[PDB]
């Protein structure tokens, strides 16, 4: 919102540089859906996608691949958008924010991706812009949560055809909640996987993973507090740009949000009694090991000595040759040992 | 009126004058020589090394016109990075740090900067600086900085004091790095004590960087007409680097942090291994000295008769129980 | 889609100057920087110069500092490389490369020469 | 100025085998270094930049690496057209700078 562009050490001054480190491919994809019909319309190219700004119906316009810095900045300048909203769409490395414009919304969120058998949370930023009757999206990577809205748009199902892009907006922001609520639910399956493994088998493996979903969980805080900052100023007044009729809207996708950051710190709860439960359940271990060490020496330690007593190169013994005196001994040597075990057997060591 | 520093191996004095035409400096002790040019229309950097001498920074104040308090404060090398502003003179308080990369500790000079009229003081502390690129820029007449007036240098100063922050940065990060691969592969208590000393140099950079933020947005945003108009978007120049610098050292710390975690919880499983392997040994041989105890009792009345081959049969049942003690472990696998 | 092509270099005798120009297809100087490399044959690549037709800023290597003048037409979309008093060791083949930055950390930023011309010799 | 000296000058080897070539600098720069190959006749073509990051269609045998002020080149499973010229360069100040070449041979 600044009046200057930040400058960088290094850079030649005013240079718009990607951030991610995502560059395999780039995509647009158009959707110009009226009250009647709509029309769908993927290209490569962007001047073919400028003209849809003053297209009276509502218009969904979404960029992959905003490593092509160029077309971020035709777009940015096309659609009378300031150089640091520009500058904030290609900075991946920032939490979600709102910007309220005079001619158009600025949001930055966050959609989640996580993999089975490679315990990474990998973040991948998305940026709204919300212009006039029109709907600019930016993505960083192909794939994204909007599907949904995309097969409602298509075959007429909803609301969405009756409204205008504020409703859209709203579509898209709660389609990537309901992605976030599907995260949780991977998430509590992969918690519940790593307290059995870490109860009943403890080695250094579980302690990487319970880190690494430290790591993970402590991510998703911080992604999920500002959402939630967002989802407020975005329903609380909002005069400009969105009709107080989408307002309650937004409303259900704000409580969505408190939802999900209470649940966060339920997990994070969880994890975060992990560790210590960790260490208790290798110490067990230690102690069964422990018990066997202090067995083995209860029953022969002491036996050794008076074995050695009477067992001694001593020319004053009396009982050399006593009648069955080795049987006799050995027996109380035995039931020493017997009653001793039976003795461990009632610590049920 | 005391020098709260240690330091007072060496004093010097050096001055030069520069203009569009020509520039003059020299490098001497006297202090006489640096008053004229406070009437030089011409701007000109004059710079104290030795802050240790009470006498040199009082005179200089007063022929100057430098506030008691400030004053003071210039000996004071204990302060965090400050501005003030006055009808005639500004003053700003940094930090110049040294770091070494086989010594893991980094050190503080305070350098102060007074700019008035047409000069601009420095109070450093020691010899060696960070100025040789902006100095050279002077002396060779490479840049725009002869051209403009005074305050070009004091923003040229400040630039070359962020870009040293720069360089110590690079050296952070590589010592990172070489850390990362450290605490991947080695693990052990001197790797605990290097991120410690790290973490703890980051904490500096950090308390020390933010007051320096503040710094250059207040003389940004404040803008005395001292300071002048022409000067302003080279400082919010340095004003972003200094962005940058806090943006990186917070990265920084958070991934020295993040380090030490799994090391630290490794422990008490190597103490598993150690049992493992003492009560392995114990179980198998010491019920075997026993034994052995047992059946070489020298009680005088034993089945001493060989019969069938006893020796090897003896040692026959000493090898079976080991088997069997053997045999008996790994079953549940614990070892 | 993107294409460099190179023209104006081959032959010239030592102390002269000559440029050479860099077109630019399927792409826009404007939004990217633009590299001039150097490469004597049998020996390693040199770099020259980097413009960013953008801001104007001008970079040049240490071997011509001052010798060479790297501009861009952003109206003609081409880069200009125009150099002076030519030397013994300049006969080598010149090449035009695309950069783009990347991100490592907030204070290093470096950029990869991603596309490169045909390259055009010089003597 | 700052310079760049990659070894060896030269690796003669067979297919299948790891090639591995290292890359340091007079003065440590962070990770703005990039490895190119290039073919006899052919301009260089980009491999790994960032000191670790493949290339949008590069094969995925090769893989950059840094310890420190050290790069490492490394291709795990060799292919026929493998063999050719390597360089780095060095994009962490505004003076770039390559090194000296590493051909790789059969």
């Known amino acids: 919102e600044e009046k200057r562009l930040s400058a960088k050490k290094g850079l030649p001054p005013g240079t718009l540089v990607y951030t991610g480190k995502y560059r395999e491919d780039f995509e647009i994809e158009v959707m110009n859906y009226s009250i009647e019909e709509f029309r769908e319309f993927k290209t490569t190219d962007v001047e073919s996608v400028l003209p849809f700004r003053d297209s009276s119906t509502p218009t969904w316009i979404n960029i992959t691949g905003i490593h092509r810095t160029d077309v971020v900045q035709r777009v940015g300048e096309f659609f009378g958008i300031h150089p640091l909203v520009l500058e904030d769409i290609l900075n991946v490395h920032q939490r979600p924010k709102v910007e309220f414009f005079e001619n158009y919304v600025f949001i930055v969120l966050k959609m989640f991706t996580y993999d089975k058998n490679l315990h990474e949370l990998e973040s991948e930023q998305v940026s709204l812009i919300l212009t006039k009757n029109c709907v600019l999206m930016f993505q960083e990577k192909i794939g994204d949560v909007f599907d949904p809205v995309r097969e409602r748009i298509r075959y007429n199902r909803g609301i969405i055809r009756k409204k205008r892009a504020d409703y859209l907006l709203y579509s898209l922001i709660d389609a990537l909640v309901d992605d976030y609520f599907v995260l949780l639910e991977k998430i509590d399956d992969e918690i519940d996987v790593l307290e059995e493994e870490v109860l009943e088998r403890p080695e250094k493996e579980t302690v990487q993973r319970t880190h690494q979903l430290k790591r993970n969980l402590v991510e998703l805080r911080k992604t999920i507090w500002p959402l939630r900052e967002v989802l407020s100023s975005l329903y609380r007044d909002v005069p400009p740009l969105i009709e107080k009729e989408t307002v309650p809207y937004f409303r259900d996708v704000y409580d969505h949000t408190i939802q999900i950051a209470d649940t966060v710190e339920t997990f994070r709860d969880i994890v975060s009694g992990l560790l210590d439960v960790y260490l208790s359940s290798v110490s067990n271990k230690t102690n069964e090991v422990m018990k066997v060490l202090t067995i083995i020496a209860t029953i022969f330690m002491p036996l050794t000595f008076i074995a050695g007593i009477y067992g001694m190169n001593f020319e004053y013994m009396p009982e050399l040759r006593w009648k069955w005196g080795y049987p006799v001994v050995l027996a109380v040597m035995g039931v020493i040992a017997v009653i001793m075990v039976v003795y461990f057997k009632k610590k049920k060591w | 009126l005391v020098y709260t520093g240690k330091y007072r191996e060496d004093f010097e004095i050096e001055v030069m004058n520069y203009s569009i035409e020509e520039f003059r400096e020299f490098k001497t002790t006297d202090v006489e020589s640096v008053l004229p040019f406070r009437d030089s229309s011409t701007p000109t950097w004059i710079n104290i090394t030795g802050i240790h001498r009470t006498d040199v920074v009082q005179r200089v104040g007063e022929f100057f016109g430098i506030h008691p308090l400030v004053l003071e404060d210039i000996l004071n090398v204990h302060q965090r990075p400050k501005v003030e502003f006055f009808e005639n003179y500004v003053f700003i308080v940094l930090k110049m740090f040294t770091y070494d990369k086989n010594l893991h500790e980094l050190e503080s000079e305070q350098v102060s900067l007074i700019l008035t009229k047409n000069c601009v003081l420095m109070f450093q502390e020691k010899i060696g600086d960070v100025f040789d690129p902006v100095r050279e820029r002077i002396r060779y007449n490479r840049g725009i900085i002869r051209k403009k007036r005074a305050d070009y240098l004091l923003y040229s100063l400040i630039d070359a004091l962020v870009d040293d922050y720069f360089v110590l940065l690079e050296k952070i990060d590589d010592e990172i790095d070489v850390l990362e691969e450290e605490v991947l592969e080695r693990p052990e208590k001197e790797t605990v004590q290097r991120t410690h000393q790290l973490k703890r140099n980051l904490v500096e950079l950090r308390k020390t960087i933010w007051p320096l933020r503040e710094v250059l947005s207040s003389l940004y945003r404040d803008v005395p007409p001292l300071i002048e108009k022409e000067t302003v978007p080279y400082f919010r120049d340095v004003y972003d680097h200094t962005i940058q610098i806090a943006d990186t050292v917070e990265t920084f710390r958070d991934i020295v942090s993040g380090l030490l975690d799994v090391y630290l919880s490794s422990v008490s499983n190597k103490t598993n291994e150690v049992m493992k392997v003492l009560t392995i040994i114990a179980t198998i041989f010491m019920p075997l000295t026993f034994i052995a105890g047992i059946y070489g009792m020298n009680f005088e009345y034993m089945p001493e008769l060989r019969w069938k081959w006893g020796y090897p049969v003896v040692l026959a049942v000493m090898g079976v129980i080991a088997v069997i003690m053997v045999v008996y472990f790994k079953k549940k696998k614990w070892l | 889609e993107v294409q460099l092509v190179e023209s104006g270099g081959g032959l010239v005798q030592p102390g002269g100057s000559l440029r050479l120009s860099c077109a630019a297809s399927g792409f826009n100087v404007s939004y990217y920087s633009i590299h001039w490399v150097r490469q004597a044959p049998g020996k390693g690549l040199e770099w020259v110069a980097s413009?960013?037709?953008?801001?104007?800023?001008?970079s040049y290597a240490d071997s011509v500092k001052g010798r060479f003048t790297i501009s861009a037409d952003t109206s003609k979309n081409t880069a200009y490389l125009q150099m002076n008093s030519l030397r013994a060791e300049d006969t080598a083949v010149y090449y035009c490369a695309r950069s783009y930055w990347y991100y490592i950390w907030s204070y290093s930023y470096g950029n990869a020469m991603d596309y490169w011309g045909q390259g055009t010799l010089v003597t | 100025d700052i310079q760049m000296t990659q070894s060896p000058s030269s690796l003669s080897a067979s297919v299948g085998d790891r090639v591995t070539i290292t890359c340091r600098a007079s003065?440590?720069?962070?990770?703005?270094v990039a490895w190119y190959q290039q073919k006899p006749g052919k301009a260089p073509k980009l491999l790994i930049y960032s000191a670790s990051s493949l290339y949008s269609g590069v094969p995925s045998r090769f893989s950059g690496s840094r310890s420190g002020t050290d790069f490492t080149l490394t291709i795990s499973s060799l292919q026929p057209e493998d063999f050719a010229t390597y360089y780095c360069?060095?994009?962490?100040?505004?003076?770039?700078?390559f090194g000296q070449g590493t051909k790789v041979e059969i």
């Open positions: 413009i960013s037709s953008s801001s104007g800023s001008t």
């Open positions: 003065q440590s720069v962070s990770s703005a």
């Open positions: 360069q060095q994009s962490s100040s505004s003076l770039i700078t």
